[PDB]
Amino acid sequence: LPNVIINEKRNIHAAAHQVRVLPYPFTHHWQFERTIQTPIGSTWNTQRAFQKLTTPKVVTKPGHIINPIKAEDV
């Protein structure tokens, strides 16, 4: 930078909110950073894009008895 001076001091208050550890199963911090980039709210995505992003993993009917698996539905 020809005439620009950049403050090299770190913002400690902002650094408190950042993630300290590198989560499993990630070896490099570049790998973990990629997953968090995509936003998920309905403000930034269409309604059908929002629905596929918020798909629940387990769906249960409220009143039906759940039986164990039986030979791939026999």
């Binding site: 009917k61 409220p62 009143g63 039906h64």
Partner: protein, 53 residues
């Protein structure tokens, strides 16, 4: 919990089908709205047959 209910009225007999319901907590302050509110009641109950007199 899918089952059929037979309701007898002065006008005739009605057969209805129940899709789903929270059975254990039904007699509780929050879940009771499921049957009280007409819109929520239509969600879980349908009229499959009606035979008037």
């Amino acid at each position: 919990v899918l089952l059929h209910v037979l309701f007898e009225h002065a006008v005739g007999y009605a057969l209805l089908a129940l899709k789903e319901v929270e059975e254990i907590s039904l007699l509780q302050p929050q879940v009771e709205e499921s049957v009280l509110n007409l819109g929520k009641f239509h969600s879980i109950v349908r009229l499959v047959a009606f035979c008037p007199f």
